[PDB]
């Protein structure tokens, strides 16, 4: 077994953007390793899912994050 | 339009990633991909047409077809606010006791009981000289096991 949890991405506490960084490259708030769900926004201006999620920047996002 | 695509269970996030890179590479009209832990074995793909999704998944391993019809935006809204973040506690994980007299005490998980939904904990506090057993829900993950 090689689960390698440290290699999984963290999620921005403010905007939920996925990244390996301690702080969010988008909004610079702290990230957390405590998140669930995945929304990949490819085209924010055409995605009504992204509109409903309040996401206007393309990228991978957690559905929720806590810390 | 939004469609539900069947996938292997536990591979939803990975297929969503592969879908995302394929969509960008081939310039398909695919606008978002949603993998909810409330929809195990399913990935939701938002696209202009069904043909875009058919093209997207063609020859893709661990994918078994598109669900008939569409998924309306009303069914997706609740998925955007997930509930009950049920962590997966494992042997080797470092945890912290949430409530009670040992609130805030940290421990290594030495054993996990699925049948009873319990975990056995080697506490960092040497004052308690024995591993104690608690329900999973009385504990939160501090750090994941290393392998
Ligand atoms: Fe390893
Ligand atoms: Fe693990
Ligand atoms: Zn952010």
Swiss-Prot record, chain A:
GO biological process terms on file: regulation of DNA-templated transcription
Subunit structure: Heterodimer composed of Spt4 and Spt5.
Function: Stimulates transcription elongation.
SMART domains, sorted: Spt4
NCBIfam families with a match to the protein in the record: RNAP_arch_Epp
Binding site for Zn(2+): 12, 15, 24, 27
Keywords from the UniProt entry: Metal-binding, Transcription, Transcription regulation, Zinc
InterPro entries: RPABC4/Spt4, Spt4/RpoE2_Znf, Spt4_arch, Spt4_dom_sf
Gene Ontology MF, one: zinc ion binding
Protein name listed in UniProt: Transcription elongation factor Spt4
Lineage of source species: Archaea, Methanobacteriati, Methanobacteriota, Methanomada group, Methanococci
Origin: domain of life: Archaea
Similarity annotation: Belongs to the archaeal Spt4 family.
HAMAP family found in the cross-reference section: Spt4_arch (MF_00949)
Swiss-Prot record, chain B:
InterPro entries: KOW, NGN-domain, NGN-like_dom, NGN_dom_sf, Rib_uL2_dom2, Ribosomal_uL24_CS, SPT5, Spt5_arc
Gene Ontology biological-process annotations: regulation of DNA-templated transcription elongation; regulation of transcription by RNA polymerase II; transcription elongation-coupled chromatin remodeling
GO molecular function: structural constituent of ribosome; translation elongation factor activity
Keywords: Transcription, Transcription regulation
Organism domain of life: Archaea
A GO term from the CC aspect: ribosome
Domain KOW as annotated: residue spans: 91-122
Described purpose of this protein according to its UniProt entry: Stimulates transcription elongation.
Membership in a protein family: Belongs to the archaeal Spt5 family.
Subunit field text: Heterodimer composed of Spt4 and Spt5. Interacts with RNA polymerase (RNAP). Forms a homodimer in solution.
Database matches in NCBIfam families: KOW_elon_Spt5
Domain comment (free text): Composed of only a NusG N-terminal (NGN) domain and a KOW domain, similar to bacterial NusG. The NGN domain is the effector domain of the complex that mediates the interaction with RNAP and is essential for elongation activity.
Name under which the protein is recorded: Transcription elongation factor Spt5
Organism: Methanocaldococcus jannaschii (strain ATCC 43067 / DSM 2661 / JAL-1 / JCM 10045 / NBRC 100440) (Methanococcus jannaschii)
